[PDB]
Design a protein around this ligand. Structure first.
Ligand SMILES: O=c1ccn([C@@H]2O[C@H](COP(=O)(O)OP(=O)(O)O[C@H]3O[C@H](CO)[C@@H](O)[C@H](O)[C@H]3O)[C@@H](O)[C@H]2O)c(=O)[nH]1
Length: 419
């Protein structure tokens, strides 16, 4: 069981190159199923889900190969079933459904736990496709979709805002007969990225990033080259790394506009921030951060995915600061770990009351959540002495070589093999 052994305190400073967003790479890889011509997807991170997706794609008849890019040739897709063995470890698997039925008139995806259980978590996907005129069958442990001829454009109103369902509907709609409108579409930068990809292939889409996406169906999608946008949350994690350690950092291969709220919040903490077309710089001028008030909310507001990171910030800042989860529930389970590190905080309802301390103390800690976990690693970096963060595999699933990146920033870090 891999562990991160950290020796603190160390100031985090210098430069880091932000990886492509896993969450944009995924829906794009699936949307590639629509492409009749070869496609090159650039800036794709080397992460478990990407490997799983590649294997899934190959099984369908797609020719796949990777390095920094992933090369895809779906001209020959001829198997329209995503099997149990290939989908099991991954929710994103459902994204194969829409493109298959949209392009091929048929497709199916295995539902772990069977139909009764597995159909529930993907109801919005099913709803969307139905709206598009597909016949959905729940049988033999699968969710099946078929349509005679092309899908049919539709006016679709979402009762729940969903990144997953928005991608399914938008992707499928690009091949539909007519106009499709998605009301209450997810606003995520990842959605914007997937829409842009689609358009690069020849799709007609507008409104991506807003509450309303309008798609005009076309007969076929071609091929081309497309670069996946930067990981906004990874970016935020590094900015915070410097912000809590008195450091200066420059984030390369970044996209400032996906981070409005985070940058604003960092400014409130006293950070000196500068931005360019593809970079972001943060300078604490050797100063401690100032406590901030944080309210997580739907994009483009403050991201819940940045919560743990800012909670940590508050824990070592000058003053008291409160972080409120306005939508999410039971998001503070990692706080007790920080307290064990010498932090002062109270969990109240949907909030955490942070009383900043000058310095943390090394300890043996662990969190199940990916974000909470990386936060523990940052904490170790600035704490006094030795910290051991257990179960880092969680981090490995969403961070591309965080140890290398941290070390290049001055961290004293070591990956330990089963303690
Ligand atoms: O078929 C579906 C799909 C989603 N939901 C629900 O609607 C919400 C929307 O899901 P979705 O947007 O697709 O969430 P995730 O895909 O798990 O995660 C993305 O969407 C979240 C907001 O929902 C953001 O907080 C994350 O940062 C972002 O990565 C979920 O809580 C689900 O409970 C359904 O009931 N049926």
């Amino acid at each position: 069981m891999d562990k991160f052994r950290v020796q603190g305190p160390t100031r985090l400073q210098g430069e880091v190159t932000i990886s492509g967003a896993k969450n944009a790479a995924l829906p794009i890889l699936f949307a590639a199923l629509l492409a009749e011509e070869p496609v090159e997807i650039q800036n794709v991170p080397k992460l478990k889900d990407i490997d799983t997706t590649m294997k899934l794609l190959t099984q369908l008849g797609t020719k796949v190969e990777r390095x920094g890019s992933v090369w895809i040739d779906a001209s020959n897709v001829n198997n329209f079933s995503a099997p149990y063995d290939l989908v099991k470890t991954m929710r994103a698997s459902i994204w194969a459904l829409g493109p298959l039925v949209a392009r091929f008139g048929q497709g199916q995806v295995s539902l772990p736990g069977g139909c009764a259980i597995g159909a529930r978590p993907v109801d919005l996907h099913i709803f969307g496709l139905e709206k598009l005129g597909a016949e959905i069958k729940l049988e033999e442990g699968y969710v099946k979709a078929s349509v005679n001829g092309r899908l049919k454009g539709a006016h679709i109103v979402m009762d729940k805002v969903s990144v997953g369902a928005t991608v399914t509907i938008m992707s499928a709609a690009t091949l539909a007969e007519g106009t499709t409108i998605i009301e209450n579409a997810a606003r995520e930068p990842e959605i914007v990225d997937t829409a842009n990809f689609l358009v690069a292939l020849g799709a007609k889409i507008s409104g991506q990033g807003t509450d309303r996406i309008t798609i005009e169906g076309v007969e076929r999608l071609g091929g081309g080259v497309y670069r996946v946008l930067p990981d906004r949350i990874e970016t935020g994690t590094f900015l915070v790394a410097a912000a809590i350690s008195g450091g200066k950092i420059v984030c390369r291969n970044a996209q400032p506009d996906t981070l409005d709220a985070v940058l604003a919040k960092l400014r409130e903490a006293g950070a000196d921030i500068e931005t360019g077309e593809d970079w972001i710089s943060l300078d604490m001028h050797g100063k401690r951060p100032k406590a901030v008030t944080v309210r997580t909310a739907p994009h483009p507001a403050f991201p819940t995915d940045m919560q743990a990171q800012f909670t940590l910030l508050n824990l070592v800042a000058e003053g008291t600061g409160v972080i409120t989860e306005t939508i999410f529930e039971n998001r503070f389970m990692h706080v007790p770990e920080l307290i064990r590190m010498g932090a002062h905080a109270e969990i109240e309802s949907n909030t955490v009351i942070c009383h900043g301390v000058e310095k943390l103390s090394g300890a043996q800690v662990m969190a199940t959540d990916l974000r909470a976990s990386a936060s523990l690693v940052l904490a170790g970096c600035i704490a006094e002495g030795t910290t051991v963060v257990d179960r880092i595999y969680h981090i490995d699933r969403g961070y591309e070589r965080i140890e290398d990146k941290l070390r290049a920033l001055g961290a004293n870090i070591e990956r330990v093999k089963g303690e």
